[PDB]
């Protein structure tokens with residue numbers, strides 16, 4: 182038996198969420214639909230301009246782990262919070278979902294990471310992230326037994342921003358592959374890809390990463406192209422399996438020359454897109470670690486993603502396993 | 512001119528919200544639909560049993576103040592938080608809505624009040640409140656100039672639980688009436704009324720309170736009767752104006768022998784009832800301080816209340832002023 186289906190590793194963040202008008206993003210020089218890194222001064226400034234908000238546990242990989250647990254898989258998470266109230270919220274929410282979470286805070290300062298997420302009328306989300314205690318995630322936080330006992334270890338491209346997190350991930354790759362497990366990553370954000378393009382390609386080409394998640398813009402950014410067909414051909418050559426999402430156009434799963442196209446589900450309304458890619462990964466990796474076909478993995482991904490975008494909060498509040506049963510994906 | 516239309520005074524609380532099944536309340540001996548006071552140990556215990564949650568600024572009077580500001584009225588708030596992250600959230604949210612909020616934290620312990628609110632499938636809400644820093648609210652927190660400059664000062668029956676808050680309220684009553692202003696209270700909760708029945712009646716009969724808010728169960732509790740008609744007659748005899756809500760059956764406003772019935776909004780599906788009474792008071796008091804008819808104050812209350820129960824979070828995230836305009840209440 183394997184202790185865990187999916188271990189995820191990422192920046193442990195609490196989301197601070199508010200709806201804004203289109204002009205707010207322009208006035209504050211916030212890049213729409215992107216992850217904008219901010220310092221403590223800028224965090225204070227933006228918060229002062231933000232309307233009344235709601236808080237919810239976030240973090241890309243955090244959300245993915247939670248989604249796997251929701252669907253019925255066995256999940257674990259590495260990510261560093263502070264010993265403060267926001268850290269306690271994060272710890273509570275992930276553990277309450279039944280995700281193994283044991284990363285120890287190193288003190289109260291720097292404080293727990295937070296992201297101010299501004300949701301526009303079109304449902305797009307623009308994130309402004311102070312990493313705080315995330316900068317302290319390092320090799321000391323790798324629970325080697327957990328990596329050793331997880332079918333897939335999945336990590337964020339976002340981890341290349343803090344200083345020592347990459348060293349943890351290299352340790353995870355070694356342990357995972359020594360124990361016959363698979364490694365996976367998400368490209369996270371097109372500007373993140375702009376920052377770490379060479380490093381990400383090296384991860385794939387050296388075989389440190391076996392399965393890659395991207396959206397259209399991230400794939401385009403990875404190869405600095407406007408040609409989506411080129412991006413697909415190249416990503417298929419650079420990694421064993423690629424899952425590429427295309428928003429309302431669903432997704433395509435690539436393996437060698439194999440291509441499997443999957444439709445997006447029908448939705449009532451795009452309330453808030455926060456978590457879409459994270460939950461696509463949840464559904465895909467749940468399917469994958471249950472031995473499902475790549476097409477069915479895609480379908481599970483699109484189902485979870487479609488559900489999360491119809492609510493406020495990056496982690497579905499409803500039962501994904503029940504939704505999967507109803508959709509006949511079981 | 513007057514600086515403020517409505518000053519509210521209450522327990523400053525951050526809500527921690529989760530959906531639960533019916534059995535959870537029974538298993539945990541939580542009184543359904545009520546405010547259950549808890550100590551620090553019980554707070555830890557219930558949190559350990561709670562699922563993934565969302566946080567949102569709460570506090571009955573805090574919600575009411577926010578609602579008045581949302582509608583376009585000029586509002587202020589007294590309530591005590593701690594110098595901690597939850598306190599910072601509370602401070603941000605109320606000030607961001609444009610409510611005057613200047614109450615200074617006294618330290619980091621006790622920490623900021625929180626309430627674990629469990630919402631059942633029927634949309635009912637069952638609150639479990641650790642008062643924390645609320646126990647420190649006292650006469651030293653009365654901004655005398657603010658009370659002097661507010662058309663109405665409104666406070667929670669809930670304030671009779673912490674030890675010294677009542678002293679602040681009596682100071683408010685004196686200043687308000689010395690400056691020709693009006694005093695208002697909500698009965699808050701039927702068990703709260705059970706606890707402080709004699710004191711509440713004394714506040715009304717002595718003329719310290721001019722305008723009283725109750726729901727059906729609170730009014731019944733106040734006179735320990737099963738006869739709602741008796742309750743209406745008696746409450747009208749005990750205070751100058753009474754606003755009595757009847758859930759789906761709308762509301763009735765009483766002044767001496769005058770009675771004005773108002774219809775509730777027909778609701779598609781009740782999402783979460785948290786804040787219904789608070790926002791009824793927002794609509795009523797906004798109308799009242801704009802010189803509107805008692806019936807129209809009722810209509811405004813029912814409009815705001817109907818909006819808040821169709822969302823997660825006790826403070827409407829949409830424009831109440833715009834809804835009031837569409838409704839011809841303006």
Ligand SMILES: Nc1nc2c(ncn2[C@@H]2O[C@H](CO)[C@@H](O)[C@H]2O)c(=O)[nH]1
Nearest residue numbers: 426428429431445446457458483486
């Ligand atoms: N139906 C629909 N699905 C979306 C939309 N945006 C994102 N998604 C889903 O979320 C995933 C990641 O963006 C996509 O593969 C889709 O499955 C949308 O606008 N409509």
Ligand SMILES: Nc1nc2c(ncn2[C@@H]2O[C@H](CO)[C@@H](O)[C@H]2O)c(=O)[nH]1
Nearest residue numbers: 756758759761775776778787813816
């Ligand atoms: N339509 C409707 N309104 C409600 C309900 N519960 C509370 N409210 C509104 O909120 C106020 C306080 O409960 C009432 O006067 C109602 O207008 C409900 O179930 N249906």
Ligand SMILES: Nc1ncnc2c1ncn2[C@@H]1O[C@H](CO)[C@@H](O)[C@H]1O
Nearest residue numbers: 192194239240241296310339456495
């Ligand atoms: N730098 C970051 N690293 C990891 N996750 C992030 C970052 N910024 C925002 N997020 C998370 O992205 C999620 C949506 O994909 C949000 O829940 C938010 O917490």
Ligand SMILES: Nc1ncnc2c1ncn2[C@@H]1O[C@H](CO)[C@@H](O)[C@H]1O
Nearest residue numbers: 522524569570571626640669786825
């Ligand atoms: N003891 C209390 N005093 C004042 N407000 C409270 C108390 N317990 C819960 N609340 C608030 O009641 C609101 C709903 O009316 C919630 O937002 C919650 O924060």
Ligand SMILES: [K+]
Nearest residue numbers: 453489492494
């Ligand atoms: K969402």
Ligand SMILES: [K+]
Nearest residue numbers: 783819822824
């Ligand atoms: K609500």
